[PDB]
Design a binder for this molecule. Structure first.
Ligand SMILES: OC[C@H]1OC[C@H](O)[C@@H](O)[C@@H]1O
Ligand SMILES: OC[C@H]1OC[C@H](O)[C@@H](O)[C@@H]1O
Ligand SMILES: OC[C@H]1OC[C@H](O)[C@@H](O)[C@@H]1O
Ligand SMILES: OC[C@H]1OC[C@H](O)[C@@H](O)[C@@H]1O
Ligand SMILES: [Ca+2]
Length: 297
């Protein structure tokens, strides 16, 4: 029943931030070092790209039209019709060598995204240089906490009272109390401790049953976690090791899309993993996900 299929063979260097746009039946994502925001029309099977001038680490839908994205250390807005990209807000202005990493829109339309020191190789970087931010609908930015190694996967409970969060080099999935009307968070705690063979926790999405799916970078898998118990429910393996993120999409959010990377693989690794950097689809998981929220500014 569970089927893993490589569905887009474009060999991205580090595919990240998959988000399903049901209005266009398209998958949006980024290829970070390639400095492109990608939109894959799954019907026509055509990919369109917007080139940007710095590494781009996440993309989200913008409610009023178009898209938003994290490029370098700037929150940016994109009009797809004119390919125009402009800055909404900047962060980490006191940092020499930082960039945004993962980001996602909360259930009130705020664009959460966190930063990291820039890497020279995978997970080789200055420690604790990142912070978590959110871009509010009025374009102001809230700073939540600092000392982040690599800001990564994040999502919100279905009752909108819990915020789930991954700093990759903590090797844990954490939770906070979260207030929907204000976007405030409180009382960080560990919810899941990654096993050795699960490697580095990367991207994460919630499903319609309130369980969490986490992409395991270097672990060649996604895992399903119960945040209520702190236990793993399921593991699904993929034929690429550097699985970076996941989201639900397609008909009624019943299909999972998984991004991955070829950056960091040596000659032998590339040969063992011919689909490194491609987009995968997983069907038959037996759960559906939920629609992404759109940025409200
Ligand atoms: O550290 C290697 C990779 O780990 C996963 C991060 O999301 C990505 O930005 C980073 O480049
Ligand atoms: O001051 C009370 C208010 O504090 C903020 C909460 O989001 C709101 O629901 C509550 O009513
Ligand atoms: O959302 C389900 C659970 O997720 C983990 C949180 O630490 C816990 O407080 C919450 O009840
Ligand atoms: O309520 C503000 C915003 O919250 C996110 C929703 O996806 C968007 O439609 C809404 O406009
Ligand atoms: Ca990531």
């Amino acid at each position: 029943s569970i089927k893993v299929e490589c569905v887009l063979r474009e060999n991205y260097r580090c595919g990240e931030s998959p988000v399903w746009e049901e209005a266009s039946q398209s998958l949006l994502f980024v290829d970070i070092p390639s400095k492109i925001i990608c939109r894959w029309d799954t019907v026509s099977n055509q990919v369109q790209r917007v080139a940007v001038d710095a590494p781009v680490s996440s993309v989200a839908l913008r409610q009023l039209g178009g898209y938003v994205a994290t490029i370098g250390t700037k929150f940016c807005a994109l009009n797809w019709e004119n390919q125009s990209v402009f800055v909404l807000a900047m962060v980490d202005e006191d940092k020499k060598n930082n960039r945004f990493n993962d980001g996602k829109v909360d259930p009130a339309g705020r664009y959460f995204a966190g930063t990291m020191a820039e890497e020279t190789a995978p997970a080789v970087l200055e420690r604790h240089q990142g912070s978590l931010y959110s871009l509010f609908p009025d374009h102001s930015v809230k700073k939540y906490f600092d000392q982040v190694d690599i800001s990564n996967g994040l999502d919100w409970s279905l009752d909108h009272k819990i915020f789930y969060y991954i700093d990759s080099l903590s090797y844990t999935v954490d939770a906070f109390d979260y207030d929907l009307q204000t976007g405030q968070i409180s009382n960080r705690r560990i919810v899941y401790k990654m096993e050795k063979d699960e490697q580095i926790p990367d991207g994460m999405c919630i499903d319609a049953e309130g369980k969490l799916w986490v992409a395991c970078y270097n672990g060649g898998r996604v895992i399903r976690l119960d945040p209520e118990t702190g236990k793993r429910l399921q593991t699904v393996k993929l034929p690429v090791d550097k699985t970076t993120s996941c989201c639900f999409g397609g008909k009624d959010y019943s299909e999972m899309y998984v991004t991955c990377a070829r950056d960091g693989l040596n000659a032998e690794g590339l040969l063992r993993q011919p689909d490194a950097g491609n987009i995968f689809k997983i069907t038959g998981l037996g759960v559906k996900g939920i629609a992404p929220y759109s940025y409200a500014g």
